[PDB]
Design a protein around this ligand. Structure first.
Ligand SMILES: CCCCCCC[C@H]1[C@@H](O)[C@@H](O)[C@H]2[C@H](O)CCCN21
Ligand SMILES: [Zn+2]
Length: 1006
């Protein structure tokens, strides 16, 4: 095994370091606007050192942007691949690369057998080539690493099944910034090489100067060097033909043969058909470009992409590009003076050639670690707005992410008869989720009608996850002797207190109890994590007089709180809460096995149970209306606005300011009231910013201000303020608090609502954000760079720390954030924008809906924690912080029994299940086989995080995922897509995964 805290990795290019050293000066550099005039010695090239040129045709296809997936399919993409099929068939030497399997599958199932076999031919012989082979070309900023794997597996499996192919080269031309989570995943999936485009123009500049655009990209912790994937960064502004042939767009544009008159060259200089008349001169023009570009690479091998957005649509586009290019090649290759071999190639061809050139001693390649955020395409145009854009759907991503994992896991335990339609529903759930991983989905960068389409897809996916989950729970918890299922029937419905969230929609069922009508109700909790988890759960009940027992009929400590619903009187411009008189919240701690189920019973009585406590309700306002709660025991107490100090359990004592905003945290009963000021601030737009670009007009200024609701219970206490736009809540359950905001920006125009945390922590210039919920990276705030440059993705978490203290904020939804000062954390909530970015949308953001954002807040003492070196580019969470994240992203699933009596009800599932070390996670459990298959196969993905040793350790059972199901007959260790066996495990025992490593195993059963 390998240590990731003490031993700082020795890299050629550490990106944080480089960031400290660069000028980031926006120097006009010539025709290559963001570079220089490239000079090459022409006597570099002779017969023994010829230039090898791969011209690589592509179309960039958005699975949704201006148009929906199916719109783009009918209008554009079906034609593209219909021609690719016809042309590559007809033209043996013609090549094409393809990335988006979403469209490829959409096309191939329409094909007519003959067509499928021909499509197979041109794949077999290497003419058509899949690159990455993801369901989509994913966003790398906002996407969770699990969903990155998901989309990958969807596409690559499709490819394995239908095409017999597994791509080992990746292609990422349009993501807005690049994440190291990609090489992490791709290298663990048997990939050999990757390619990126959109990095910061100044980084393109700094790297090109040093011949560092090709590099072995390794993880920020990786000392040993095994995570390292070969990366080709492309050097120019775009992936268009203008920016691909070499440094001069004016030149490059004349070899985009589609442009001769709908399309045209914005350098005024048209392309011209190649003939015997012009060949030699055009050839010279072009070879000079190639050779210029080739100067930026350590080898005499060179990659020339040929295409653009939805290219190769027209039949005649295929001739015009091909024929003209054939003419140039045929010339250049016979003209020995040039010293150039030029041909239509694929991305693998390019890559294999680079390595073959490295075999022949031409180059030794540099090591790089770090990330490629925050991307700027030009001047002070940083793309940090998209970290936040359409935040509803960002939340929705996470919810569905959870529902996918749980539905796959819950149904994994049993083989299912085909009539059950479990496969079909899981297939769809994954696809819809995989689709939203697209760099115009989760980013929030599409048109309104497309965002609508994604929602509908995701809604259907959720509906599908519920069905699979309930059917499964019913099977797992009903005696085999009773189990006699109607696959189409609802045994259970989910309850989700967090999605959409109670302000957002009235979507939660009330359990209706009564002495005559329905005396008691079975509820079931699911725990997807492979450890014992205790967690507070709530349900809506029709009476306060409800007691909780387990199925073993033993009483369970409960709290009843009312059902609060914030109203806005337009009458007053006031944010008042309202009580429900007809429904109540029952809260109790559920204990649930590793990867298991636990049943519970809610029973009514005629009065207060022994073991059910009531919460008091204080409503601080100047001038109250007295407020009925019906049968609720305790009447609402009223008062003038005061400073507050609540505790719950032994877990921390939180002080609140007089308008209900956390003002300090006291950890123990010795520790100081350590100050932590929540503030709300607004940003605006310059007059001198849109769906992609964060363009602020100066520092953020506070929101002008105010009703405060305190609920105080034995299990749970909240503090809830209704400010304009935001209903802010602080919930306390005897650990690190929960922050919920119901954000409605709504009317407020050209505005961006942020959440700041002013602490007296001596962070200085240092903060740490995460990347894809996989890793925490160090960020230095840079005085040189503008504000929006200091904003990073917060997909899951961020933290600041001094020598003694840390404050971590975990999220349940990816947002934008920064530590703009010493002891700050901030994080964007929503953004409404009238102005377009002019990146091709046509709109700003004018479609905002209410969203319930969720957080956790972990203040901690870190002085006796085994801390990484000042030099180390990574951070690592503590137990507390890590569990807080798990609590956000993977909560307990709640199931209410639909009918009146549950004959055959069992109490529990998986009490026999091993309870694995807290730092281990079964990220995926998925059955890989249908019932009508001889051998049942079940894949597992295990991820081991790394946490700070802090003394902090109670013994736990080793988990061997090979033996989680009986009759194991084979356990191979696989690629993360499950598509290739890496290891035969003798004795069918899965070894321990190292910290920061991610393994996948497939177990076979008999
Ligand atoms: C082009 C289209 O592929 C679309 O994906 C769009 C991005 O949203 C922003 C950069 C330019 N891109
Ligand atoms: Zn795109």
């Amino acid at each position: 095994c390998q240590d990731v805290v003490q031993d700082v990795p020795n890299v050629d290019v550490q990106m944080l370091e480089l960031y400290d050293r660069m000028s980031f000066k926006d120097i006009d550099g010539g025709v290559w606007k963001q570079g220089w005039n490239i000079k090459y010695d022409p006597l570099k090239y002779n017969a023994h050192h010829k230039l090898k040129v791969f011209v690589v045709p592509h179309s960039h296809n958005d699975p949704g942007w201006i148009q929906t997936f199916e719109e783009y399919y009918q209008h554009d993409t079906k034609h593209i691949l219909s021609n690719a099929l016809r042309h590559l068939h007809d033209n043996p030497e013609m090549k094409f690369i393809w990335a988006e399997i979403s469209y490829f599958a959409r096309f191939y199932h329409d094909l007519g057998e003959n067509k499928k076999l021909q499509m197979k031919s041109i794949v077999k012989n290497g003419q058509l080539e899949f690159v990455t082979g993801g369901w989509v070309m994913p966003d790398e900023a906002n996407s969770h690493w699990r969903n990155v794997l998901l989309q990958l597996t969807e596409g690559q499996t499709w490819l394995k099944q239908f095409m017999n192919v597994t791509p080992t080269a990746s292609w990422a031309i349009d993501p807005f910034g690049h994440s190291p989570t990609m090489p992490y995943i791709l290298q663990k999936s048997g990939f050999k090489n990757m390619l990126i485009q959109r990095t910061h123009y100044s980084v393109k500049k700094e790297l090109a100067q040093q011949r560092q655009l090709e590099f072995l990209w390794r993880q920020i912790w990786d000392n040993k060097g095994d995570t390292a994937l070969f990366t080709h960064m492309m050097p120019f502004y775009s992936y268009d033909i203008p920016h691909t042939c070499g440094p001069d767009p004016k030149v490059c544009c004349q070899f985009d043969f589609k442009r001769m008159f709908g399309l045209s060259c914005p350098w005024k200089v048209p392309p011209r058909t190649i003939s015997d008349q012009n060949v030699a001169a055009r050839s010279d023009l072009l070879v000079d470009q190639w050779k210029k570009k080739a100067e930026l690479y350590r080898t005499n091998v060179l990659l020339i992409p040929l295409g653009d957005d939805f290219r190769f649509k027209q039949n005649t586009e295929w001739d015009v590009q091909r024929v003209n290019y054939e003419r140039l090649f045929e010339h250049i290759n016979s003209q020995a003076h040039f010293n150039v071999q030029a041909q239509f190639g694929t991305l693998q061809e390019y890559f294999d050639a680079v390595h073959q050139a490295e075999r022949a001693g031409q180059a030794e390649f540099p090591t790089l670690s770090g990330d490629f955020f925050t991307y700027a395409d030009r001047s002070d145009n940083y793309w940090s707005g998209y970290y936040t854009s359409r935040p509803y759907h960002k939340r929705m991503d996470r919810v569905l992410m959870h529902y996918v994992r749980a539905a796959e896991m819950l149904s994994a335990w049993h083989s299912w008869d085909g009539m059950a339609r479990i496969e079909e529903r899981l297939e769809q759930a994954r696809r819809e989720l995989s689709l939203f991983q697209h760099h115009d989905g989760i980013t929030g960068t599409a048109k309104t009608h497309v965002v609508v389409d994604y929602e509908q897809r995701m809604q259907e996916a959720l509906k599908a996850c519920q069905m699979v989950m309930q059917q499964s729970v019913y099977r797992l918890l009903t005696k085999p002797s009773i189990y006699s299922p109607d696959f189409s029937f609802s045994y259970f419905t989910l309850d989700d207190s967090r999605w959409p969230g109670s302000g957002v929609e009235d979507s939660r069922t009330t359990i209706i109890l009564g002495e005559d009508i329905l005396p008691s109700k079975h509820v079931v909790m699911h725990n997807t994590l492979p450890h014992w988890r205790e967690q507070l759960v709530d349900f809506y009940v029709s009476s306060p007089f409800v007691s909780v027992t387990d199925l073993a009929n033993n009483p369970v400590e409960a709290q009843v709180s009312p059902v609060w619903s914030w109203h806005h009187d337009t009458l007053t411009k006031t944010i008042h809460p309202q009580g429900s008189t007809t429904k109540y919240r029952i809260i109790f701690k559920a204990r649930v096995p590793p990867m298991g189920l636990a049943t519970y019973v809610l029973t009514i009585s005629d009065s207060k149970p022994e073991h059910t406590s009531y919460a008091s309700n204080l409503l601080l306002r100047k001038n109250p209306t007295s407020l009925p709660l019906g049968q609720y025991p305790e009447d609402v107490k009223f008062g003038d606005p005061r400073e507050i100090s609540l505790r719950v359990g032994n877990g921390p004592t939180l002080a609140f300011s007089e308008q209900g905003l956390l003002k300090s945290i006291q950890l123990t009963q010795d520790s100081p009231h350590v100050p932590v000021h929540f503030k709300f601030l607004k940003y605006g737009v310059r007059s001198h910013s849109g769906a992609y670009l964060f363009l602020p007009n100066g520092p953020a200024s506070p929101v002008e201000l105010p009703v405060v609701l305190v609920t105080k219970g034995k299990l749970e206490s909240s503090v809830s303020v209704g400010l304009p736009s935001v209903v802010h809540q602080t919930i306390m359950r005897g650990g690190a608090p929960e922050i919920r905001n119901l954000v409605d920006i709504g009317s407020l125009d050209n505005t961006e609502i942020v959440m700041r945390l002013e602490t007296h922590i001596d962070s200085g210039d240092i903060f740490y954000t995460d990347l894809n919920g996989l890793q925490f990276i160090k960020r230095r705030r840079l005085d040189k760079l503008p504000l929006q440059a200091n904003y990073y993705p917060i997909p899951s978490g961020m933290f600041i720390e001094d020598a003694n203290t840390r404050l971590t904020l975990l999220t349940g939804q990816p947002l934008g954030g920064s530590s703009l000062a010493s002891g700050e954390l901030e994080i964007m909530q929503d953004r409404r924008l009238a102005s377009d970015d002019e990146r091709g949308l046509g709109q700003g953001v004018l479609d905002n809906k209410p969203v319930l954002h969720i957080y956790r807040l972990v203040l901690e003492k870190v002085n006796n924690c085994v801390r990484p070196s000042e030099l180390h580019p990574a951070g690592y969470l503590t137990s507390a912080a890590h569990k807080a994240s798990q609590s956000l992203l993977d909560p307990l699933d709640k199931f209410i029994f639909a009918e009146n009596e549950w004959i055959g009800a069992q109490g529990q599932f998986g009490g026999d299940h091993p309870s694995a070390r807290e730092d281990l996670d079964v990220s995926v459990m998925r059955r890989l086989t249908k019932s009508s298959a001889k051998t049942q196969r079940v894949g597992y993905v295990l991820h081991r995080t790394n946490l700070m040793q802090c003394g902090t350790e109670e013994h736990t059972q080793k988990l061997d995922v090979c033996h989680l199901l009986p009759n194991v007959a084979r356990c191979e260790r696989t690629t993360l897509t499950f598509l290739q066996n890496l290891e035969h495990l003798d004795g069918m025992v899965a070894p321990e995964v190292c910290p920061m490593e991610t393994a996948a195993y497939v177990s076979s059963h008999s």
